[PDB]
C-alpha cells in the first residue's frame, strides 16, 4: 500500500511533465491545462478510493514528504495542483492537507520556492476549514514565521512574504473565518504585552 502510493505518485509526476515537456500542440492552454490538472486529480482519486479512515493521514504525510523531497519547482507545483484539485473535488478533508503541509519539517524558510508554493496552496484551501482548525493553523503559521531572522536576502523577501497573505486572510474581519477573539487570543499568547 505504501509502495502502491509511491508508484502512483511517481508515475503521475513523470508522465504529466514529460508529455507536456515537448509542446507539439499536445495541449490547448486555457482550461485544457485545468483538464491536465483534472487528470492528475483523477489519478489521485483512484489512489484514494482504496483506504481506511485511520490510515487517512500517514499517507498524507508521505505525500507531503514526497512533494517536499522534490527539487524541480514545476514538479512541486504540479503535485500541489494535484493536491488542490484533490481537496476541491471533495475527496480530501481540507484540514489534514494544511496541517501536514505546515507541520512538515522540510518546510523551512530557506526553501523559498517551496515556501511560496506551500503558502499559496494553503491560501487556496484554508477557506473550508472549521474555525478551531483555523485557530490551530494560525498558531502553527505564526510559529513558522517566527523562525525567520531579522535580516534575510533581498531577493527571497517576496517569496517569504507569501505567509503574510495567509495571515492577512485569517485575521480579515469581513471574511469571518473564525471569531476574531480567537485570533487575538492566539496572537497574545504568542506575543505577550511588551513584545514587538
Amino acid at each position: 500500500m505504501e509502495t502502491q502510493l509511491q508508484s502512483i505518485f511517481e508515475e503521475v509526476v513523470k508522465t504529466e511533465v514529460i508529455e507536456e515537456a515537448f509542446p507539439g500542440m499536445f495541449m490547448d492552454t486555457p482550461e485544457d491545462e485545468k483538464t491536465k490538472l483534472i487528470s492528475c486529480l483523477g489519478a489521485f482519486r483512484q489512489f484514494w478510493g482504496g483506504l481506511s479512515q485511520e490510515s487517512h493521514e500517514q499517507c498524507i504525510q508521505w505525500i507531503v514528504k514526497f512533494i517536499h523531497g522534490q527539487h524541480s519547482p514545476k514538479r512541486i507545483s504540479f503535485l500541489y495542483d494535484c493536491l488542490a484539485m484533490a481537496v476541491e473535488t471533495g475527496l480530501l478533508p481540507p484540514r489534514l492537507v494544511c496541517e501536514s503541509l505546515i507541520n512538515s519539517d522540510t518546510l523551512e524558510w530557506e526553501r523559498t520556492q517551496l515556501w511560496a508554493l506551500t503558502f499559496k496552496l494553503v491560501r487556496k484551501i484554508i477557506g473550508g476549514v472549521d474555525y478551531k482548525g483555523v485557530r490551530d493553523l494560525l498558531k502553527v503559521i505564526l510559529e513558522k514565521i517566527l523562525t525567520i531572522p531579522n535580516t534575510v536576502s533581498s531577493a527571497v523577501v517576496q517569496q517569504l512574504l507569501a505567509a503574510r497573505e495567509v495571515i492577512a486572510y485569517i485575521l480579515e474581519r469581513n471574511a469571518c473565518l473564525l471569531p476574531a477573539y480567537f485570533a487575538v487570543t492566539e496572537i497574545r499568547k504568542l506575543y505577550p504585552e511588551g513584545k514587538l
Binding site: 483523477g42 489519478a43 483512484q46
Partner: protein
C-alpha cells in the same frame, strides 16, 4: 419510411470510424472503439462523447 432519418445519423458516426480505421492501417497501431479502463467518471475521458 420516416425511420430512415434516425438511421442516417447513426450511419454518420459508423462511417467516421471507417474513415479513421482505413487511415491508420499502415502505421503501427491498434484501433478500438471501447477502452475499458477505470476512473472514467472523474477523468475528462468520462466527460466526452
Amino acid at each position: 419510411m420516416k425511420r430512415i432519418i434516425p438511421w442516417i445519423q447513426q450511419l454518420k458516426f459508423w462511417l467516421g470510424q471507417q474513415r479513421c480505421k482505413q487511415s491508420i492501417k499502415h502505421l503501427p497501431t491498434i484501433s478500438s472503439e471501447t477502452l475499458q479502463l477505470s476512473n472514467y467518471s472523474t477523468h475528462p475521458i468520462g466527460n466526452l462523447s
